[PDB]
Design a protein around this ligand. Sequence first.
Ligand SMILES: COc1ccc(CCN(C)CCC[C@@](C#N)(c2ccc(OC)c(OC)c2)C(C)C)cc1OC
Length: 446
Amino acid sequence: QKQQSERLGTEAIPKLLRSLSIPAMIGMFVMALYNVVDTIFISYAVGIEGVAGVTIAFPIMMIMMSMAGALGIGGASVISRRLGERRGEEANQVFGNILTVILVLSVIGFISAFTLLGPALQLFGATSVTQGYATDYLFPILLGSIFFFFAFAANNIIRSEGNATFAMVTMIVPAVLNILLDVLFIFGLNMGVLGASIATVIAQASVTGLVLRYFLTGKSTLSLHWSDLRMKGSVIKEVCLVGLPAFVQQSSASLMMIAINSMLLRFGSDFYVGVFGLVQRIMMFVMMPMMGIMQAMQPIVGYNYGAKQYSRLRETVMLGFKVATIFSIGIFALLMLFPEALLRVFTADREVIQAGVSAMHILFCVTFLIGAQIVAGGLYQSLGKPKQALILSLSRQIIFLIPLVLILPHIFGLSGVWWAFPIADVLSFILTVVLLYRDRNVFFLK
Ligand SMILES: COc1ccc(CCN(C)CCC[C@@](C#N)(c2ccc(OC)c(OC)c2)C(C)C)cc1OC
C-alpha cells in the first residue's frame, strides 16, 4: 500500500492507450534516427570495415541488454500486477531488488570486458581490420555496462508504472546527445568507432543521472525507496520468472543472428554485413508502430489485472488487437507496393531489384498476421504467467524456424530462405490463435 502518485490509475481507457502508446512511438522512433544518423557517420570517418565491426559487435550488446530486459520486464509485469492488485509496497521492494541483480551484472560485463571480449569477438568472422573495430566498439560499452542496463531497466519500469512521457525523455535525450556527441568525437575529433562508443556511453551516463531524479528527487509516479529498501528478494525468483521468456526472445534472435552474420563473413567479408545492418532498422523501424502500441498495454493490462476492472481490460485486449491489426495490414501493403523505392536505397543491378525484391515480395505476405502474433505476447507477459509466452516464443523464434530453414537448405534452395519464413510465422500465428481460445479470459468479451 502506497500513494498512487498520478499513476493515471483512473480508468480513462482507450485514450489511456492513445496517450500511452505515442510516447513509445515517439522516443522509439527518435533513437532509431540516432542509429541512422550515427551510422551514416561510421560510414565516413571510417568505411564499411567498421560498419561491420559494429554489426558483428552488435549481438554481444544484445546478450547483455537481453538479460537486463527480462529484468526490466520482470519488474514491469510484477509492478503492474502489484498495483491495481494494489500491493503498492511490494512494488517499492521489487524495483530495487532488481537494481541488485542489475548492479551485480553491471560488474559481470565490466569484468567480461577485461575478459571474454576478444575471445568471443574473434570467434567467427575475424577480418583483421574489422576485428579491431568491433573490439574498439565493444571495449567501452562494457566499462561502460552499468549506465547501459540501469537505463533500459528504468525505461522499462517507468513504463511499468506509467511515465511514458518521461520515457520519451529517457529516450529523446541520449538520442539528441548522442548525435551531437558523435559529431563531437567521430567527425569532430578523429576518435572514430573507438570514440562513437565513448560517445554512446557518455550518453548512458547523462541519462542515469536523470533517472535517479525521477526515482529519488520528488520521486515521482510511485513507490521508490533508497537506503536499505532492497536487498535480495525471494522475488528475484519472481522476476526471472517473468523475464524468462523475455530474454529468450532476444537470445533467440540474437544467438541465431551471430550465426547469419558470421556465416555472412565467410562469403561477403564486409560488403554484405552493412546490408544486414541496413535491412534491419527498416524491419525494426517500421516495426515500431506495432512495438509502440504494444508498450502501451505493457502496464495498462497491468493495473486492471491486479484485482481491478477485468471488465475494462478485455476492452484493452480487444482494442490492443483491433488497432495492431490495422497496422498489420498497413505495414504489409506499404511493405509490398513500396518495396521498390526502398530497394532504391539498394539501387544496384537490375537483378538486385529482381530476386532482390523477389524475397522482399511474398516473403512478407505474413506481416498482416503479425499484428496479433505479437500482441498476444504482452498479454502473457504483463499478465506475469509467461509460461505460455515461453511456450509461444520458442515456437516463432526457433522450433519452427530453424527446423524449416534446415528442412529447406537440405537442398531446396534460396527458397529455403523464402518458404522458411512466410510459412513459419503462419504456424506461430495459428498457434497464437489457439493460445487465446486457450484462455477465454484475456478476451472474455467477443
Ligand atoms: C539506434 O542505433 C543503435 C543504438 C544503440 C545500439 C546499441 C545496441 N544495444 C544492445 C542497445 C539495446 C538494443 C535495443 C534496440 N534496438 C533493443 C532492446 C530490446 C529489444 O527487444 C524488443 C529490441 O528489439 C530487438 C531492441 C534498444 C533497447 C536500444 C545499436 C544501434 O544501432 C546499431
